[PDB]
């Protein structure tokens, strides 16, 4: 949820400045001692700011913050790709051992280089095949921006049945990863001349192909 109000999304461009606000009440943000935190999804937060304006140990002066009455502001100057993250403000609420957080803001940094996907396509393992199943695994990495579409082929037919593809997940380098699984029986796998994973990204397709005759 989040008690303190933040924009859900903000965008800035590489090398420029962006600001995130944090609104509360006279009894929290209004009292001062606002803090700020940076988090990458799936990872632990990092404290940026405490006491409204003080940078935490080791935080560079690119990050600054301010407060006016019931609204605190975090400003990030000289935006870099590594600043893409979620940002949360916080305050004590009626006690030094009770805290409320902001609703969180996801920062996007525009102007980054486009990067096509790297594609790796793995055939089924012998161990899996020994159980009469064959899972083809298509691993997709280092693409920017974070949108792909995946098409599976077998001997020139498009296969949609028993395909499951993940969302794109931002990696640390701000590029994205995704994976696609085609879940077959061993007979279905062995029936075909070849299978392909075709990954389209910003209108360009990167295809890898495996052949049961080469792979089993």
């Amino acid at each position: 949820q989040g008690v303190l109000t933040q924009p859900s999304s903000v965008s800035g461009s590489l090398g420029q400045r962006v600001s995130i606000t944090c609104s509360g009440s006279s009894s929290n943000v209004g009292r001062g001692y606002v803090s700020w935190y940076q988090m990458t999804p799936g990872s632990a937060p990092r404290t940026l700011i405490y006491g409204d304006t003080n940078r935490a140990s080791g935080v560079p002066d690119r990050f600054s913050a301010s407060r006016s009455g019931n609204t605190a502001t975090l400003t990030i100057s000289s935006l870099q790709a590594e600043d893409e993250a979620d940002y949360f403000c916080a305050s004590a609420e009626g006690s030094s051992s009770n805290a409320v957080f902001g609703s969180g803001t996801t920062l996007t940094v525009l102007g980054q280089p486009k990067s096509p996907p790297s594609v790796t396509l793995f055939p089924p393992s012998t161990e899996e095949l020994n159980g009469n199943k064959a899972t083809l695994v298509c691993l997709i990495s280092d693409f920017y921006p974070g949108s792909v579409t995946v098409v599976w082929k077998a001997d020139g037919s498009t296969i949609t049945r028993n395909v499951e593809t993940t969302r794109a997940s931002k990696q640390s380098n701000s590029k994205y990863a995704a994976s696609s699984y085609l879940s077959l029986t061993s007979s279905d796998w062995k029936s075909k001349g070849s299978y392909s994973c075709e990954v389209t990204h910003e209108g360009s397709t990167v295809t890898k192909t495996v052949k049961p005759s080469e792979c089993s």
Partner: protein
């Protein structure tokens, strides 16, 4: 160096049970530090749970106070949290953290605080003071004063890693781990891309390493997909030049670990 914190506890708890987590601190310069707990539920913001300070005094999120108990054992540098009667709404990543908690005396504009009075003395006893009568204030009565208001400061200094806790009735399924090689798509490649398929498990998470942590550069472990089977699968890959290779897969909920040998020959 620097304090580091590590959460431990179950990755899966059944509804109506007690969730019990432990926070172990290491590497502090200090004898003890105040430790708090924060959770983040899928798609919610961060939510405070509570803390215990170096005097053993606790404070809690008032919304959760009746369900929480935080205790410590400084001889083990540990702090524990218990949350009673959990429901799926308590599924979250749980963090422990060092916290700064301080009560400040706030004064109106134009009023000083502290025992630094300026030719002036005996201002220390007053919370908020001015020596403004026109000359020196030798005694507390020579100063204008008001009573201060109290402002509470809270922030987190250092965060733990975070422990994923699922609250669910669902059964566990340990993964089946299969070795992968890209070899057969390009047998003359200078490098070989190896992998492991961590197939068909519940709940999250799993952890993957390679060669017991000796292989880290070039490793890419992917987020899991939730499949029609109703189970998760994820994969991990590593590229090596054309030596044993082993993916180390742990699934805490099932107390299972598999170190799967992958053939790098191509």
């Amino acid at each position: 160096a620097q304090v580091q914190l590590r959460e431990s506890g179950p990755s899966l708890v059944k509804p109506s049970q007690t969730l019990s987590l432990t926070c172990t601190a290491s590497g502090s310069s200090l004898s003890d530090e105040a430790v708090g707990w924060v959770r983040q539920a899928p798609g919610k913001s961060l939510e405070w749970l509570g803390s215990i300070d170096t005097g053993g005094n606790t404070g809690y999120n008032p919304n959760l106070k009746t369900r929480l108990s935080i205790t410590k054992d400084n001889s083990k540098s540990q702090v524990s949290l218990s949350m009673s009667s959990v429901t799926p709404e308590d599924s979250a990543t749980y963090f422990c953290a060092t916290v700064h908690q301080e009560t400040h005396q706030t004064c109106p504009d134009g009023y000083n605080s502290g025992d630094d009075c300026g030719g002036n003395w005996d201002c220390g006893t007053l919370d908020c003071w001015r020596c403004d009568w026109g000359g020196f204030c030798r005694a507390s009565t020579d100063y204008r004063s008001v009573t201060a208001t109290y402002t509470y400061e809270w922030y987190i200094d250092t965060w733990g890693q975070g422990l994923l806790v699922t609250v669910s009735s669902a059964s566990t399924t340990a993964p089946k781990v299969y070795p992968l090689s890209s070899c057969c798509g390009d047998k003359s490649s200078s490098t070989v891309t190896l992998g492991c398929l961590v197939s068909s498990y519940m709940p999250e998470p799993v952890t993957v390493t390679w060669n017991s942590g000796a292989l880290k550069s070039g490793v890419h472990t992917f987020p899991a997909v939730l499949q029609s089977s109703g189970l998760y699968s994820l994969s991990s890959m590593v590229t090596v030049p054309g030596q044993t290779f082993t993916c180390n897969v742990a699934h805490p909920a099932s107390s299972t670990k598999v170190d799967k040998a992958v053939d790098p020959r191509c």
